[model samples]
Target: MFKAVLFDLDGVITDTAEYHFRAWKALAEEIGINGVDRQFNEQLKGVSREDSLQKILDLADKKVSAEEFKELAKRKNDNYVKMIQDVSPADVYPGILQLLKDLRSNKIKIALASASKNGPFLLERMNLTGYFDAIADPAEVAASKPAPDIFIAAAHAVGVAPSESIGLEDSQAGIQAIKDSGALPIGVGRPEDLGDDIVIVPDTSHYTLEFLKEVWLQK
Candidate 1:
């Protein structure tokens, strides 16, 4: 059994993805890139804010001065913050609370490894902050996912080796990061939505202690 389980915030624990998509879509329209859609927003999953902004710019085939870029990024985040202001415990996925509780009962360490700098704020909004043993700080990682830095740091924070951990993610970048960190990857969406050749939980609502034991631990 894994000693620790690290989670990606937005899609795995909550539905903040919608808020992010709305924020990005609004920003895209503001910059005259009216073509932003859910599929385009998928490209931003598990990506850093600055990197996400660059991707948005690339999608529009536009470039801006560094100052202008920063302003747009800030604007996007401000919109996101406003959208998430109403988040509460009800916003957390159905089975996630039970999963966290069970993990704690089993003495398994729980860590959050998200690329979002606002992770803590979101957790606080959902009243889920106390569930985590460690929450990744973006500054501690040299680069975002597809790089193992954040996961490795998260594992270290929980005093566990990556090989003794399991990571749950909803993005390809996050899956790659977990693989690179030497941890088992548990993709959190449909196989098509997550990635190829990985163990995937169709959705959080179907997850349970039995599911973990049958699918992951027993393996």
Candidate 2:
């Protein structure tokens, strides 16, 4: 059995993607770029803030100096942080808390492996910080998902080897990171969206202890 499970913050544990999309869209519109929508927002999943802004900028066909990009990215994050300030237990996905509790009961370590620098703050906002044994700090990772840095660091934080861990993610980039980190990959979305190889649940709503122990946890 895996000793640790690393969860991605945005889509895996919570539904903050909507909040992030809204903030990014608002920024896009403020900068004279229109048509920012869910499709575009999907591209930002598991991506770093700076990378997300760069992708949006590419879509807008706009280029900026490094300083300008930094300022704009910070602005988007500020809006997102403001929007999520009031998140409560109600904002967490159904069955997620139970799953975390179950993992804890089984002596499985849990960690948050997110690309967002605000992962800790979001957990605090949701009052779910106590569920995680460790949170992958963005300050320590140079590269984002699709890179193994964050997930590997998360496993290390919990004193587990990558091979002895499992990582739940909703984005393809995150799946790649899990694989590269030598951990099992569990996708929370469609198989088509996340690729056909990794195990995919319909969503976090369907995640259950039975699903984990009977399916994923069984070697």
Candidate 3:
């Protein structure tokens, strides 16, 4: 049996993906990088804060000192935290609460394996922290999404192996990580640039734990 289900934050759990985008856009502009938009923000999906800023810096053909980089990172996170101050349980994605309840009832563990360092914060704000047995910290991983480390760590956090878990994600980068971690990948709010080979759903609204079990069996 699949021992656990790991989830990404942002679009998978809530729509905070936009807030992160807006914050990154503002930070890029503040550093004099221009032309950032929703499409550009898509590239930042499932990216770490430091890597996201590095992408922004690369756009302007710029580099910053170590101290300056930390400064900018803090600024960007500050903007995001400020934007999310009003977030509440109401922001949770459709059917997530019930799915979590179902997982718990079936004795499946749950973990947050998001690229966001704010995973715990967002879950706490949404009053959904109780649903998770572990929240993986992005900084603790050697590399970010497209790297399997975060998902691997999340599986480990719940005392499970990636090969015995399922990962729920929205970003293609995140889906790749899940695949590499040996976890079954379930894409939610999947972006346009997705592979036809993977299992996908529009969002949590479209599936349930029974569906997950079928996927596991098929795999």
Candidate 4:
């Protein structure tokens, strides 16, 4: 069947969590938040910039005017974008390149459906911009992951129906979005986290085009 593949850029293609954590940590420190650590950063994954900053503010029992809040979020993103500029092709997870190449060989259209507004910027940093047939701009969609808006937007970018494609993701919210979009979801996370009804790979290293095709057909 003719199909498209939608990818969530961060954990699926490469791990940019460290950079994201560092930027958030810096912002937390600047804003006098207590106990901001890697574990805390884990909660922010797959969350929007504004929502994430709000969570941090909530943790610190802090409040600010709307103007101040937006400015703070913007500052965090500035640091994150600068930190991400250092990533290279080597940063792409194992097996990801092979999977992309294999999908390419079979003439499958690939699209990015990342929650991060920096999808193109980060993919370029990872030297993976050329592999994708389309990059869905998160800015173009009003809703984020867990809403199916961005995922469906990606499917639209490639001119494919969501049900005719498979979506890859790592976070629970991303997985839910894929499911809600009517696309089969291939998740890179623990089976328990992703649940039994979906295809779950332990990590990016565990994915293969043949395995994916089998799963898609079975679905």
Candidate 5:
């Protein structure tokens, strides 16, 4: 039986992925870098801005200094903040709050594992800051997703091994990270990216504790 749950923030709680994509696309254009494919978005999930921007630079065959990437990434963040300024709890996926409440009521410790340092601000705006026992951002870890460190840190913080926890995420990179961390990965929002270890859910629109236990919490 799992004692805890760890969640990915972006596409799991809200549709921020689209806004992030838009910001990145606009930044890429402003930088005069073409070939910044949307597929790059998948590669970026649960990763640090440094890593993501480097990947994009590599993809575009643009030799930019690390300082330049940092500046551009900061610009992208500014755009994202502006885009989400008015976002509210209603911006999150339907039933997500209910699911969190149910988990809390069941005495299941919940941790938020996200790539963004801005997670706390967003959570506060979404009225979700108090629901998690811990929140792990790349800013708190040595490395980013696909490296397993962030998930590992979250599990460690909860005093549980990853196998005794379940992770909910919506990106291929995030799924891979959860798998690498030794947890069962529940691929929400996007399912095809998952392997056998993953359970697919369409969205959080009508999810319930019963559905989660049947699909993901089953041993």
Candidate 6:
């Protein structure tokens, strides 16, 4: 039996990616950067803010000094916080709560695998603090997604073997992390970027306990 479920918080638990994208766009534009386009934001679905900022700067062809990046990144986060203050429980996608409840009901451990340092804060804002047993953020790791560090660390924190864990993500980067870490990856969105190896779910509501119990939990 699987011991734990590692979740990607942004698109997985919280519908707060729009705030992040907006914050990044605002920050980039303020700094004379072109900012992320619709195509770019779509490609960044499951990435961490730290990496996202770096990627944005790289795309702008203007490498930010560490000090500058840190300052600007913080500014972006401030904007994101301001933008999301009005968010409520209704902002959370349906069935995600039920999935967490079901997992907990079955006595399964759960962990958050995300690149955002603000992940915990977002979860709290969305009233999701009690759902996870632990979290592994990119701020805690040396590398970001596709490296497997965060995913492996999440499994370790939850006291589970990587092979025994199932990671649910909405981004291809997240899928790469889980795949690299030897965990089964279940993609939550229909992104063409999510390579064919991962099983896809249209949204959280499509994840039924029966699916988890019969197909997911044991797989």
Which candidate comes out best when scored by TM-score? 3
Local distance difference test, each candidate: 0.85, 0.86, 0.87, 0.85, 0.79, 0.82
Q: Which pairs clash in model 1?
A: none
Clashing pairs in model 2?
none
> Which is the better candidate, 3 or 4, if ranked by TM-score?
3
* Candidate 4 clash figure, as a count: 0
Q: Give the poorly placed runs of model 3, Cα more than 4 Å off.
A: 190-192
Candidate 3 scores a C-alpha RMSD against the true structure in Å of 1.2
Single out the weakest 10-residue window by summed lDDT for candidate 4: 41-50
Q: What's the TM-score of each model vs. the native?
A: 0.91, 0.91, 0.96, 0.91, 0.90, 0.91
Q: Which regions of candidate 6 are displaced past 4 Å?
A: 217-219
**Residues 121-165, candidate 2, lDDT per residue (tens digit)?**
889878888989999888888887799999999999999999998
Question: Lowest-scoring 10 consecutive residues by lDDT in candidate 6?
Answer: 209-218
Which runs in model 2 stand beyond 4 Å of their true positions? 216-219
What pairs collide in candidate 3?
Answer: none
Q: RMSD of model 2, in Å?
A: 1.8
User: Which runs of model 5 end up more than 4 angstroms from their true locations?
Assistant: 215-217
Model 6 per-residue lDDT tens digits across residues 1-37: 7788888877878767777888888888998878587
lDDT of 3 by residue, 60-149 (tens): 789789999999999999989999988898998898888899999999999999878888888999999899999898888888888999
* Lowest lDDT 10-residue stretch of candidate 1: 210-219
Residue 43 Cα positional deviation in candidate 6, in Å, after optimal superposition: 4.4
Q: Could you give candidate 4's per-residue lDDT for residues 10-56 as a string of tens digits?
A: 78898877788888889999878866786776668776677778889
